[PDB]
Amino acid sequence: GSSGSSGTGEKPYKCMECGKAFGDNSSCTQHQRLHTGQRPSGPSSG
């Protein structure tokens, strides 16, 4: 499963923003941090 991540329900265990499984919450909660930032897709070629 690489593409096509959607459905009906909530997954407070694994991050949905990107989709990455963690081992310990400690690291899980932290991950969100990076997400907090703008996290812009990216500029156009050039």
Which residue ranges make up the site for Zn ion (CB under 5 A)? 15, 17-18
CB of 32 to Zn ion, least distance (A): 7
DSSP 32-45: HHHHHS--------
Between 17 and 29, CB nearer to Zn ion: 17
| Tokens 């070629």 -> residue | 45
CB of 31 to Zn ion, least distance (A): 5
CB of 20 to Zn ion, least distance (A): 5
Q: Taking the CA atoms of 8, 12, 14 and 17 in sequence, report the sign of the dihedral they define.
A: positive
